[PDB]
Amino acid sequence: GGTHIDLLFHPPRAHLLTIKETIRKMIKEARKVIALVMDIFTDVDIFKEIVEASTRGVSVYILLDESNFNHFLNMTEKQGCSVQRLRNIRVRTVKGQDYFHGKMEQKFLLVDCQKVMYGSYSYMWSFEKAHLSMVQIITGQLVESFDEEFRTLYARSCVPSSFA
Amino acid sequence: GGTHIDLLFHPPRAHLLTIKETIRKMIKEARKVIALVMDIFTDVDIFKEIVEASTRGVSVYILLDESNFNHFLNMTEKQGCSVQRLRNIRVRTVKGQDYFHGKMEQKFLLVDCQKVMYGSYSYMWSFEKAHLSMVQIITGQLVESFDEEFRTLYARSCVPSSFA
Ligand SMILES: Cn1cccc(O)c1=O
């Protein structure tokens, strides 16, 4: 079996769901594992869906760019919903080489080693309302390469400073 | 015929060329058309390669995010190499919905309707030296979808203010 790819856009073009709806649906349908790599994560609806997946028992591994991590922390604080308390969620940070902060410029969502959303959509209010973006929904062989990249990234990630 | 995808990383993992080398090689080998969509374009080596392609006769269409366009203009000025003077290069800008500037969060390189580099690598010094990133090299059927998205984006692009 090979690889299948569909494209989604924001604003939508020739597909019924928005990218955000698609992200929420993928997370709702997760059975076992969610692996998320994200540059900036402030979107509350998407966060809620991930918390809720973790309460059904899904293992959630999140890797965030270190330089923007505080924005996710502020968002969890405001929602009164500390990620440290949630037993099925792990959050670690990734950084690039400094000079000026080097960043992890990577994002993707990998659900049940089965389906990947890969593209330019960051999990922020502004990608729902303001920005033009595109993603791929990937299934098949190429998903195993995203799995391997996730593990590679995870190996180079750090416990965030705040956590103890 | 279907679609073929290879992944490249920065830093490199199990491939001989860096992403920047790959970008320069794709542009050097262009025979007819380069279509580029880019959020920020300040890298001088990559610019030089595109200018040089255009002097061999390759048609170059570039679409840049409007809010960062000034960074590309500054770079061309500094290189004493005005894009308005170069007859085989067209540059237009794209923006999102404002509230706060909505942005075109899209980037990709499409050469000869034949090969696409699609991923998180922006054409800046910092992606060569500092940031972690990944791209896909795509050939086959899916390339026709990037072609169609390029034309769609081009249709919604504006002549930059500076140009007259
Ligand atoms: C991950 N990714 C993929 C394509 C384009 C992007 O700007 C990006 O961040």
Side-chain angles (χ1 to χ4, degrees), chain A residues 1-86 88-164, chain B residues 1-86 88-164:
Chain A
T3 290
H4 184 70
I5 299 182
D6 287 310
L7 302 176
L8 300 171
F9 308 83
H10 193 71
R13 261 222 301 302
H15 55 83
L16 300 181
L17 302 182
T18 59
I19 299 177
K20 189 168 163 166
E21 286 163 353
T22 302
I23 290 163
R24 295 186 66 176
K25 170 170 179 26
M26 285 178 63
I27 293 162
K28 268 190 220 291
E29 297 178 347
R31 288 168 23 73
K32 305 312 207 213
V33 185
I34 293 165
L36 175 68
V37 182
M38 185 51 59
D39 56 357
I40 317 191
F41 192 172
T42 59
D43 184 302
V44 169
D45 301 314
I46 296 174
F47 186 54
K48 182 213 70 67
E49 213 69 65
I50 282 171
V51 175
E52 193 172 276
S54 72
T55 73
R56 312 191 293 274
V58 172
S59 301
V60 182
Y61 303 90
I62 308 180
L63 297 178
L64 300 173
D65 171 73
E66 179 188 287
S67 83
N68 289 126
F69 177 79
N70 60 303
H71 299 301
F72 168 78
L73 208 66
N74 295 155
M75 177 279 284
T76 56
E77 277 221 325
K78 202 186 154 106
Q79 295 296 317
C81 197
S82 163
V83 95
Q84 293 194 90
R85 285 167 34 265
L86 289 138
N88 288 328
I89 302 176
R90 284 292 147 70
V91 184
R92 300 170 71 97
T93 63
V94 187
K95 76 166 200 79
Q97 212 175 120
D98 302 320
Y99 293 81
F100 176 67
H101 305 153
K103 287 179 180 301
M104 186 194 63
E105 296 285 340
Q106 172 71 105
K107 37 191 182 276
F108 66 83
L109 170 67
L110 168 64
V111 181
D112 293 335
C113 291
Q114 168 179 157
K115 194 177 257 169
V116 170
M117 175 183 296
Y118 176 65
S120 59
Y121 190 101
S122 298
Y123 291 3
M124 310 166 68
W125 114 286
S126 66
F127 283 81
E128 185 187 7
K129 302 313 194 177
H131 294 326
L132 307 181
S133 68
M134 187 193 81
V135 291
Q136 298 180 341
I137 305 305
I138 307 175
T139 53
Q141 188 62 59
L142 184 58
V143 176
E144 308 174 15
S145 298
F146 278 87
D147 182 55
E148 162 181 300
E149 173 60 2
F150 188 77
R151 291 180 198 270
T152 301
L153 290 169
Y154 201 92
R156 75 134 78 203
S157 72
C158 303
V159 177
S161 339
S162 316
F163 299 183
Chain B
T3 290
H4 184 70
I5 299 182
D6 287 310
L7 302 176
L8 300 171
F9 308 83
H10 193 71
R13 261 222 301 302
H15 55 83
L16 300 181
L17 302 182
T18 59
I19 299 177
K20 189 168 163 166
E21 286 163 353
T22 302
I23 290 163
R24 295 186 66 176
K25 170 170 179 26
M26 285 178 63
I27 293 162
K28 268 190 220 291
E29 297 178 347
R31 288 168 23 73
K32 305 312 207 213
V33 185
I34 293 165
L36 175 68
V37 182
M38 185 51 59
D39 56 357
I40 317 191
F41 192 172
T42 59
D43 184 302
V44 169
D45 301 314
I46 296 174
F47 186 54
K48 182 213 70 67
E49 213 69 65
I50 282 171
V51 175
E52 193 172 276
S54 72
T55 73
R56 312 191 293 274
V58 172
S59 301
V60 182
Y61 303 90
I62 308 180
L63 297 178
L64 300 173
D65 171 73
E66 179 188 287
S67 83
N68 289 126
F69 177 79
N70 60 303
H71 299 301
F72 168 78
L73 208 66
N74 295 155
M75 177 279 284
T76 56
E77 277 221 325
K78 202 186 154 106
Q79 295 296 317
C81 197
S82 163
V83 95
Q84 293 194 90
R85 285 167 34 265
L86 289 138
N88 288 328
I89 302 176
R90 284 292 147 70
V91 184
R92 300 170 71 97
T93 63
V94 187
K95 76 166 200 79
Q97 212 175 120
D98 302 320
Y99 293 81
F100 176 67
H101 305 153
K103 287 179 180 301
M104 186 194 63
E105 296 285 340
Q106 172 71 105
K107 37 191 182 276
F108 66 83
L109 170 67
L110 168 64
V111 181
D112 293 335
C113 291
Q114 168 179 157
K115 194 177 257 169
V116 170
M117 175 183 296
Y118 176 65
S120 59
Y121 190 101
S122 298
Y123 291 3
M124 310 166 68
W125 114 286
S126 66
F127 283 81
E128 185 187 7
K129 302 313 194 177
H131 294 326
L132 307 181
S133 68
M134 187 193 81
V135 291
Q136 298 180 341
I137 305 305
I138 307 175
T139 53
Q141 188 62 59
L142 184 58
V143 176
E144 308 174 15
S145 298
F146 278 87
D147 182 55
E148 162 181 300
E149 173 60 2
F150 188 77
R151 291 180 198 270
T152 301
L153 290 169
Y154 201 92
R156 75 134 78 203
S157 72
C158 303
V159 177
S161 339
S162 316
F163 299 183

